[PDB]
Design a protein around this ligand. Structure first.
Ligand SMILES: CCCCCCCCCCCCCCCCCC(=O)OC[C@H](CO[C@@H]1O[C@H](CO[C@H]2O[C@H](CO)[C@H](O)[C@H](O)[C@H]2O)[C@H](O)[C@H](O)[C@H]1O)OC(=O)CCCCCCCCCCCCCCCCC
Ligand code: CLA
Ligand code: CLA
Ligand code: CLA
Ligand code: CLA
Ligand code: CLA
Ligand SMILES: CCCCCCCCCCCCCCCCCC(=O)OC[C@H](CO[C@@H]1O[C@H](CO)[C@H](O)[C@H](O)[C@H]1O)OC(=O)CCCCCCCCCCCCCCCCC
Ligand SMILES: CCCCCCCCCCCCCCCC(=O)OC[C@H](COP(=O)(O)OC[C@@H](O)CO)OC(=O)CCCCCCCCCCCCCCC
Ligand SMILES: CC1=C(/C=C/C(C)=C/C=C/C(C)=C/C=C/C=C(C)/C=C/C=C(C)/C=C/C2=C(C)CCCC2(C)C)C(C)(C)CCC1
Ligand SMILES: CC1=C(/C=C/C(C)=C/C=C/C(C)=C/C=C/C=C(C)/C=C/C=C(C)/C=C/C2=C(C)CCCC2(C)C)C(C)(C)CCC1
Ligand SMILES: CCCCCCCS[C@@H]1O[C@H](CO)[C@@H](O)[C@H](O)[C@H]1O
Ligand SMILES: CCCCCCCS[C@@H]1O[C@H](CO)[C@@H](O)[C@H](O)[C@H]1O
Ligand SMILES: CCCCCCCS[C@@H]1O[C@H](CO)[C@@H](O)[C@H](O)[C@H]1O
Ligand SMILES: [Ca+2]
Ligand SMILES: [Ca+2]
Ligand SMILES: [Cl-]
Ligand SMILES: [Cl-]
Ligand SMILES: [Fe+2]
Ligand SMILES: [Mg+2]
Lengths: 38, 81, 34, 504, 37, 57, 172, 36, 341, 63, 30
């Protein structure tokens, strides 16, 4: 079965992937828009 | 020397104070009401002064069961009656 | 000409904004009586 | 010349002498294992697995031999208390002798590698410079590790070609070495399930074989090669030290909390079994089952194995020792001889009273007896002038069920108080304190000493990792920073990207 | 026969001798009570 | 006798201390803040009993 | 007392009788010695980090400095360049005289407050006392960590010099 | 730009900190935490 | 020059607050550790876990507020907001002590981020990474005291609670239960902390008092220039001064500054090792020779036997309120007390 | 340097010092294995910790 | 034996002070 704490584990896993996903999406975006001049 | 506007420019400008003479008092008031309305107690689960003990009880409501700890707290709260 | 919204600006407000909210909450608490 | 703390750096560009130094280290370690086992065999008493097992005797390597199936001596005894066993060559003695001979061979190989250091094998064929191709060496060693890990799991632990491993019941009463089948379901990840140790070795072994082949066949990416300085042997020192501290924290935690690989008959019980009265609950279960089935109180308690009662005694809790209280647990409370039986305290009214047990935090603890509901009924007072609960006032008595004292009752306050003082430690035992001149003060078991040494060394290895990682990534500046370092490189906003001249 | 070019001489200067002997002696004065117990 | 109650506390190595337990023990509570030089004692043995070395030191 | 264990005895009894931990001059003392240690390590590590290359890898970098040389032996500008980025530019010292004065002043002033804490608790002006400061709507005492401290202190007080007190209050 | 003198911003800000801290000390003697 | 290198560029821009790849770990973890502390000390109780008030909201002041450890019955639960104890309920999670493991774990990751930041910046600026190396001592302390110690004990309940008075309670607990003053690893810690504070004071004062006259001003700070080649103070005069006052003196500035790293760093690492032993109650509690003598000889007394009497008072007097899960009831008559008090 | 029979036999295994695959090569696949390993450690930690509780998985001496 | 040991280590440390001061390597401007 999917016990309730295994559902909690997936929830933590998804939340972490979202926080890290959204954080990298945002920084990549900003880095692309705002390039250093060489 | 790192590009941002000097702070001392910013905080001696009229525009900074037009913005901040609103946002600072607004934040402060909102913090005030978070407490004065009682909302803080509810969000965090902190006892009000009349909520540490039932009228006659003198034992602390210590959590003693790891996995049913949620229910124990709920039960302690019900007993405030 | 300077930007307004910079990393520094964000860092500053992440701290300043809750600090003012909290100082107002703690000020209100000083009037709480048992 | 070199400072004293750098003398071994002469090996960094000398693969043959590095292998000699490694051989010498390996010879020292294997000589240690051999000598340690000999000293343990020269001091170990195999005559009482029940009240004098190896973990009461300060044995540190004996339980490791036992864990993997070495359980007998050439002289005919076995750690499970058998007699007339023939262990074959691989007794504790044959294991010790094999380690001593290995030590000798490795010492000889070291001498050869030290003298014959200048082997063509260690020279880069393109430059004539000493060079080790570490990425390919990693795949070769990882492949070898994977094969060995696989074979240990598939053959030794299964009993398919080997002895198995130590396993026991949940109360550490009937342990022995058994073959163990791999557990392939989710319970394989339960630290207390031996089958998961088997499945681990089979599965991680296969993974190591495959990853090893990958690392033999596929070159590092340029980008990782440069970032991790893969041409610098010190990078491998840094990351291997990190792997080793990880492994050391792990074996400290599994020693302390218990697992299928730190069984209580080899290392002693855990502190948590005392905290949660794990053995007391089982003892009470058994006594209640006995009574339900119609036994007398004497018979019900007499059916409790002395081995079980002994785990329910704080003298065996590993959290009761002292850093400078050296030696075997027997040196402290003494060599355990017999259970005295279960003490039942009663007041003048005949109500059963229960001595409050000492928690592990406390070096000394008061003597307080309560009824079954926790109400205080008797104690040993400190101040007497306003005492209400003295054993003399409350007419406290003690009667014993099971063990040496079965059927006896004591009513004299000094004796009843004496037993109440012992009941704070849990079940009460007779000890021989004379043979070792025991001093009365609790020491930890090999479970505690192992956990301490490994947590400490793990923590110190974190520093080793930081240090060698630092030396690896900053090799260019380790004698100092550029004497012609540009003030531009450190002045703010000169470069748009910190330290990158192409962003001026 | 052919000598090893990786050999380096080792040095401990006098101050380092003194510092080291002080460390050792003070550690011994500190830990000795615990070794006697 | 640090606390002036005739309950002498051993501070020295030869009287059962190690480096960690040892001390020169403060002068007697019977003395208080009185100045207790060697020549105020009737004898060295008295001076020692009452913690005279502490004040000298 | 002039001795290692007797020093700890003096500390524990001082805690029982003055609640020194809850006294702000001892708190400034702790900030002075923890901060002195922190700044000692910080200054050590920053000067060490910026030593100018003068030696080879088979020799101690210490040989890179000769007693009495006129030229500074590390690069202050690289050190500040480092530390101003670790935190932010204006939190780092670029003036060695300023830095060294701070290294002198921080531990010395904190330790003067430690000394003054002892010297004013000598006249029984003691640490903060919040014993039973938090009371519920009925008047029940709601302990805080200050009350737990108080119980440890009571243990010390009732046990110290166990044969010396005849009267109920320990007044000196 | 630089219209409000920095010494005024400092003085007023500093007075603001003194007032709020002062309130916190007043609160040590009244209502919750006052022991009364 | 793909997205990785473009991101690298942006992360490493020379700005008011440097970011770096390390910033991605550091900033969120540090912000949450600090914000969680400020949030708990301001609003959150310890009624259900300790039987204590611990926030400004309940009437505590800056000295007595804390974020307190979870109840002993939680054991070493991660106490994740979505875990089996709180089950996603933010209110219940506060009441169970979830902010404690929140702060300790983000704090631990944040310290890792800080040390990576010290490495990352040293590398960019081209200096040796000794500041990061020195920071291993704060890390060894944080990890030993906030993680290893409670992990060897029954639960997180016995870790230090994040609070001024709470930490003082943790000191007094270690005295009464572990006799931690007696422990030679703590004593080495003390020597390296006090030794480091000594070095900090004496070196700052020595430089300030052997300065070269480099300006006309009686206030001497302006007579220094960051870019100047020359030492601002006289090593030779300093060396003579201490050689003649104390007997020895530094003569090598590289050694001097290395020693300033070594001493407090080494002290902290030693104290951490002792705390790892205390996780297991492996204390330096007793001198066995002392106890054997004192048990047989009721006239034998040392400051060592006196401090154990104090310890026994601390344990008996504080345990019932400090360890509420044990439900201790110690009748007045069993409490250890001397005469009168 | 001295040649020996065994050094001749092993020579190929120590003859590619410095040899690298171009650019990022297999870095992304490595990254996926690392992320999966992180999740593996998290699962086994949370099981041991009783934060992840699975049917049929009793984390106790009474397993 | 224990007292002898403590006093012996102490006396060595005192001797060491003497040599470290009067028989130090002299600091040289060079
Ligand atoms: C260097 C610096 C680098 C910077 C550091 C970065 C920080 C990273 C953060 C890591 C967080 C790790 C938390 C580990 C939590 C834990 O452990 O939680 C503990 C759990 C075990 O749980 C405990 O188990 C106990 C014993 O239970 C067992 O025994 C009982 C009594 O008989 C019952 O039978 C019970 O059912 C049975 O499970 C009690 O139940 C406890 O209440 C319960 O909490 O183990 C586990 O999760 C896993 C145990 C194995 C792995 C441990 C590796 C890490 C820890 C190393 C330190 C070791 C401590 C030694 C002290 C010296
Ligand atoms: C992992 C390491 C390890 C562990 C856990 C054990 C565990 C044990 N051994 Mg084994 N042992 C080991 C390695 C180990 N041993 C080694 C390497 C040897 C060869 C020396 C031995 C030889 C040995 C003998 C001969 C005996 C044991 C016995 C024991 C038992 C008692 C241990 C004891 O009293 O310790 C006491 C531990 C201490 C007092 C702690 C020492 C701490 C040191 C001194 C700290 C030093 C500080 C340092 C100087 C500071 C530097 C500061 C600087 C950096 C600034 C215990 C089961 C005893 C037993 O019962 O046998 C059956 C026994 O007789 N052992
Ligand atoms: C596999 C582990 C390992 C290996 C192979 C090395 C190897 C090396 N280390 Mg690293 N290191 C490690 C782990 C390791 N270290 C750990 C755990 C730490 C933290 C304790 C360090 C901290 C460290 C520092 C701070 C330095 C090194 C340096 C060195 C280099 C010179 C060593 C030398 O000449 O010392 C010679 C040592 C002596 C002559 C005597 C040392 C006596 C010790 C302190 C006490 C007795 C030890 C006892 C015999 C050990 C028992 C084993 C133990 C596991 C129980 C060498 C490459 C040095 C370097 O980088 O040079 C450029 C250097 O400065 N190491
Ligand atoms: C203070 C902690 C710390 C610091 C400053 C360093 C610093 C260093 N590491 Mg070491 N490392 C550490 C801890 C640390 N490491 C730990 C705990 C391990 C695991 C055993 C390693 C394993 C390791 C290896 C194998 C290598 C390094 C290397 C390096 C160097 C390059 C930078 C790097 O690779 O970072 C690595 C990044 C981190 C330490 C940050 C990891 C952040 C994690 C992923 C966050 C996880 C969040 C978590 C999943 C939340 C759930 C928690 C759970 C409790 C519920 C540098 C010297 C490399 C080097 O030596 O090159 C020469 C190298 O090869 N590290
Ligand atoms: C670098 C930033 C960082 C780091 C290292 C952490 C680390 C941590 N957080 Mg914090 N947090 C952060 C930023 C961070 N947080 C931010 C920005 C917020 C605001 C949203 C929070 C809010 C927060 C809360 C409210 C809590 C935590 C908690 C935790 C702990 C457990 C996290 C966990 O189990 O994740 C598990 C997830 C991962 C490790 C990510 C795995 C990513 C892999 C590699 C990819 C796989 C994902 C996959 C595609 C998904 C498929 C799932 C499918 C099967 C359904 C740990 C200390 C808990 C804690 O502190 O409790 C005491 C907790 O309650 N955090
Ligand atoms: C002479 C008096 C003295 C001295 C100098 C010390 C010195 C020391 N003591 Mg000891 N102590 C003493 C007396 C003393 N003690 C007595 C009499 C007792 C009674 C037994 C104790 C009981 C005691 C305990 C119980 C402990 C100490 C510990 C320590 C060490 C603390 C190191 C440190 O800074 O941790 C401070 C914390 C860190 C360095 C962790 C990292 C901190 C990060 C970097 C903080 C970042 C903060 C962030 C930026 C934001 C803050 C926000 C703000 C709002 C606050 C140090 C060696 C500790 C130790 O041994 O630990 C191993 C410890 O646990 N002591
Ligand atoms: C604008 C930008 C600001 C950015 C700040 C960034 C965040 C970090 C700030 C950390 C603050 C920690 C101190 C909070 C104290 C507090 O609020 O007490 C708030 C309490 C509230 O007062 C209490 O309120 C209760 C209400 O029920 C009761 O009335 C109590 O009786 C009463 O004491 O005030 C005090 O205790 C008075 C003294 C506070 C002074 C503390 C100084 C300690 C300094 C330590 C080092 C930190 C440096 C921070 C620098 C900024
Ligand atoms: C500066 C010369 C004096 C040397 C003495 C040095 C003593 C150090 C004192 C330090 C405290 C006070 C600061 C200097 C005080 C000083 O010198 O004043 C001047 C300084 C700069 O003023 P300006 O008006 O010139 O600011 C604009 C600059 O960006 C230049 O364009 O102002 C500040 O920095 C105030 C702090 C606000 C910063 C808030 C940002 C918060 C972000 C979070 C930081 C996290 C980073 C850490 C990584 C974890
Ligand atoms: C040659 C030869 C031989 C022989 C051999 C032998 C006889 C060997 C032995 C060897 C040995 C017999 C070895 C041993 C070793 C040991 C060791 C190596 C040890 C070490 C130790 C240590 C390191 C310790 C440490 C410590 C201390 C001391 C204290 C506490 C802490 C510690 C633990 C840290 C033969 C015939 C075979 C044949 C071939 C040839
Ligand atoms: C936890 C949590 C979280 C987070 C939160 C946060 C992040 C918060 C923050 C918060 C904050 C961030 C707050 C702040 C506050 C502040 C304050 C409260 C301050 C105060 C101050 C004062 C009071 C000052 C004083 C003083 C000093 C210090 C010195 C000088 C003098 C004077 C006295 C002025 C989340 C959601 C994710 C999730 C879940 C949990
Ligand atoms: C160093 C001398 C070696 C002495 C060898 C004695 C052979 S004894 C031999 O050993 C086997 C182990 O594989 C046992 O399984 C087997 O039963 C036994 O007879
Ligand atoms: C006054 C003695 C009569 C009561 C028996 C005392 C409790 S039991 C007693 O405990 C001793 C440790 O103190 C052991 O060494 C001894 O073997 C055991 O007989
Ligand atoms: C979080 C970073 C770790 C993963 C790094 C793997 C980079 S993957 C790499 O990405 C490049 C752009 O950067 C592309 O040009 C290229 O095609 C691709 O192979
Ligand atoms: Ca009211
Ligand atoms: Ca005897
Ligand atoms: Cl006393
Ligand atoms: Cl009196
Ligand atoms: Fe300096
Ligand atoms: Mg108030």
């Amino acid at each position: 079965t999917i016990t309730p704490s295994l559902k909690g584990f997936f929830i933590g896993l998804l939340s972490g992937a979202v926080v890290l996903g959204l954080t990298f999406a945002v920084l990549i975006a900003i880095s692309q828009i705002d390039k250093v001049q060489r | 020397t790192t590009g941002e506007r000097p702070f001392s420019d910013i905080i001696t400008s009229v525009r900074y104070w037009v913005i901040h003479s609103i946002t600072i008092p607004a934040l402060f008031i909102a913090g005030w009401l978070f407490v004065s309305t009682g909302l803080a107690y509810d969000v965090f689960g902190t006892p009000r002064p009349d909520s540490y003990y039932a009228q006659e009880q003198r034992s602390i409501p210590l959590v003693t069961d790891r996995f049913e700890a949620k229910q124990q707290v709920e039960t302690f709260l019900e007993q405030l009656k | 000409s300077y930007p307004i919204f910079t990393v520094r600006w964000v860092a500053v407000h992440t701290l300043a904004v809750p600090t003012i909210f909290f100082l107002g909450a703690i000020a209100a608490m000083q009037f709480i009586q048992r | 010349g070199l400072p004293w703390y750098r003398v071994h750096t002469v090996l960094i560009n000398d693969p043959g002498r590095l292998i000699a130094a490694h051989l010498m280290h390996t010879a020292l370690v294997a000589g240690w294992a051999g000598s340690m086992a000999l000293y343990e065999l020269a001091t170990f008493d195999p005559s009482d697995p029940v009240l004098n097992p190896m973990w009461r005797q300060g044995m540190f390597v004996l339980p490791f031999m036992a864990r993997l199936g070495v359980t007998g001596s050439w002289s005919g005894w076995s750690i499970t208390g058998e007699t007339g066993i023939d262990p074959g060559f691989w007794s504790f003695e044959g294991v010790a002798l094999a380690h001593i001979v290995l030590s000798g061979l490795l010492f000889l190989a070291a001498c050869w590698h030290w003298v014959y250091w200048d082997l063509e094998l260690f020279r880069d064929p393109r430059t004539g410079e000493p060079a080790l191709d570490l990425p390919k060496m990693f795949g070769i060693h990882l492949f070898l590790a994977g094969l060995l890990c696989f074979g240990f799991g598939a053959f030794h632990l299964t009993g398919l070609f080997g002895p198995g491993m130590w396993v026991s019941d949940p109360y550490g009463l009937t342990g022995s070495v058994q073959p163990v089948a791999p557990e392939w379901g989710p319970d394989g990840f339960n630290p207390y399930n031996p089958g998961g140790v088997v499945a681990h070795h089979i599965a991680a072994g296969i993974v190591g074989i495959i990853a090893g082949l990958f690392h033999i066949l596929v070159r590092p990416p340029q980008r990782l090669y440069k970032a991790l300085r893969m041409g610098n042997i010190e990078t491998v020192l840094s990351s291997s030290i990190a792997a080793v501290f990880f492994a050391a924290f792990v074996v400290a935690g599994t020693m302390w909390y218990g697992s299928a690989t730190t069984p209580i008959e080899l290392f002693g019980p855990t502190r948590y079994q005392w905290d949660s009265s794990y053995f007391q609950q089982e003892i009470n279960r058994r006594v209640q089952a006995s009574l339900a089935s119609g036994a007398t109180l004497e018979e019900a308690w007499s059916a409790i194995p002395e081995k079980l009662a002994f785990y329910d005694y704080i003298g065996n809790n590993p959290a009761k020792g002292g850093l400078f209280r050296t030696g075997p647990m027997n040196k402290g409370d003494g060599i355990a001889q017999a259970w005295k039986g279960h003490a039942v305290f009663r007041n003048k009214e005949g109500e059963e009273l229960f001595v409050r047990r000492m928690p592990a935090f406390f070096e000394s603890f008061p003597v307080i007896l309560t009824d079954k509901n926790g109400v205080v009924k008797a104690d040993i007072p400190f101040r007497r002038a306003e005492s209400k609960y003295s054993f003399e006032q409350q007419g406290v008595t003690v009667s014993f069920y099971g063990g040496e004292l079965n059927g006896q009752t004591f009513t004299d306050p000094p004796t009843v108080k004496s037993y109440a003082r012992k009941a704070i430690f849990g079940e009460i035992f007779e000890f021989d304190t004379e043979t070792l001149n025991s001093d009365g003060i609790f020491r930890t078991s090999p479970r505690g000493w192992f956990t301490f040494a490994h947590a400490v060394f793990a923590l110190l290895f974190f520093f080793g990792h930081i240090w060698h990682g630092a030396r690896t990534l900053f090799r260019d500046v380790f004698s100092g920073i550029d004497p012609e370092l540009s003030p531009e490189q450190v002045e703010w906003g000169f470069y748009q990207k910190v330290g990158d001249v192409t962003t001026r | 026969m052919e000598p090893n070019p990786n050999r380096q001489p080792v040095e401990l200067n006098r101050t380092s001798l003194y510092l080291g002997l002080l460390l050792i002696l003070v550690l011994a004065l500190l830990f000795s009570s615990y070794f006697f117990n | 006798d640090i606390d002036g109650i005739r309950e002498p506390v051993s501070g020295s190595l030869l009287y059962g201390n190690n480096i960690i337990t040892g001390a020169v023990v403060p002068s007697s509570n019977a003395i208080g803040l009185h100045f207790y030089p060697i020549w105020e004692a009737a004898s060295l043995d008295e001076w020692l009993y009452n913690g005279g070395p502490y004040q000298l030191i | 007392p002039l001795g290692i264990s007797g020093t700890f005895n003096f500390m524990i009894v001082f805690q029982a009788e003055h609640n020194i931990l809850m006294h702000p001059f001892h708190q400034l003392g702790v900030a002075g010695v923890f901060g002195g240690a922190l700044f000692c390590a910080m200054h050590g590590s920053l000067v060490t980090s910026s030593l100018i290359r003068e030696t080879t890898e088979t020799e101690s970098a210490n040989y890179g400095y000769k007693f009495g040389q006129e030229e500074e032996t590390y690069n202050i500008v690289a050190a500040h360049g480092y530390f101003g980025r670790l935190i932010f530019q204006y939190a780092s010292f670029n003036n060695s005289r300023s830095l060294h004065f701070f290294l002198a002043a921080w531990p010395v002033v904190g330790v003067w407050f430690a000394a003054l804490g002892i010297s004013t608790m000598a006249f029984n002006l003691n640490g903060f006392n919040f014993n039973h400061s938090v009371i519920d709507a009925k008047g029940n005492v709601i302990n805080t960590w200050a009350d737990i401290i108080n119980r440890a202190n009571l243990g010390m007080e009732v046990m110290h010099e166990r044969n010396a007190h005849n009267f109920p209050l320990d007044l000196a | 730009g630089g219209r409000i003198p920095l010494w005024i911003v400092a003085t007023v800000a500093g007075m603001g900190v003194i007032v709020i801290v002062g309130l916190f000390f007043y609160g040590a003697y009244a209502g919750l935490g006052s022991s009364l | 020059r793909g997205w990785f290198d473009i991101l690298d560029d942006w992360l490493k821009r020379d700005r008011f607050v440097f970011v770096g790849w390390s910033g991605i770990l550091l900033f969120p973890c540090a912000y949450l550790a600090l914000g969680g502390w400020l949030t708990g000390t301001t609003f959150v109780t310890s009624w259900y876990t300790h039987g204590l008030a611990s926030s400004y909201l309940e009437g505590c002041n800056f000295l007595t507020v804390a974020v307190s450890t979870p109840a002993n019955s939680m054991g070493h639960s991660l106490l994740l907001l979505w875990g089996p104890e709180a089950q996603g309920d933010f209110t219940r999670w506060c009441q169970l002590g979830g902010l404690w493991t929140f702060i300790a774990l983000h704090g631990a990751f944040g310290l890792i981020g800080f040390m990576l930041r010290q490495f990352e910046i040293a590398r960019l600026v081209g200096v040796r990474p000794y500041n990061a190396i020195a920071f291993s001592a704060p890390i060894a302390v944080f990890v030993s005291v906030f993680l290893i110690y409670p992990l060897g004990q029954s639960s997180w309940f016995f870790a230090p609670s994040f609070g001024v008075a709470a930490i003082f309670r943790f000191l007094l607990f270690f005295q009464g239960f572990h006799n931690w003053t007696l422990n030679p690893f703590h004593m080495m810690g003390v020597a390296g902390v006090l030794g480091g504070a000594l070095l900090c004071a004496i070196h700052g004062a020595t430089v300030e008092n052997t300065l070269f006259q480099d300006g006309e001003g009686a206030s001497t700070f302006r007579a220094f220039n960051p870019t100047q080649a020359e030492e601002t103070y006289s090593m030779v005069t300093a060396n003579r001064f201490w050689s003649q006052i104390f007997g020895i003196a530094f003569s090598n500035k590289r050694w001097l500054h290395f020693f300033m790293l070594f001493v407090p760093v080494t002290g902290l690492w030693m104290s951490a090792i002792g705390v790892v032993g205390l996780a297991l109650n492996l204390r330096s509690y007793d001198f066995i020779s002392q106890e054997i003598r004192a048990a047989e000889d009721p006239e034998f007394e040392t400051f060592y036997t006196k401090n154990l009497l104090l310890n026994e008072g601390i344990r008996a007097w504080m345990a019932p309120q400090d360890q509420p899960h044990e439900n201790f009831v110690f009748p007045e008559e069993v409490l250890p007390r001397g005469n009168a008090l | 340097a001295r040649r020996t029979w065994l050094g001749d036999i092993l020579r190929p295994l120590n003859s590619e010092y410095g040899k690298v695959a171009p650019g990022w090569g297999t870095t992304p696949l490595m990254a996926v294995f690392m992320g999966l390993f992180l999740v593996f450690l998290l699962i086994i930690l949370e099981i041991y910790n009783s934060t992840l509780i699975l049917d049929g998985v009793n984390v106790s001496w009474k397993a | 034996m224990e007292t002898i040991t403590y006093v012996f280590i102490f006396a060595c440390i005192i001797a060491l002070f003497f040599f470290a001061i009067f028989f130090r390597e002299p600091p040289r401007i060079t």
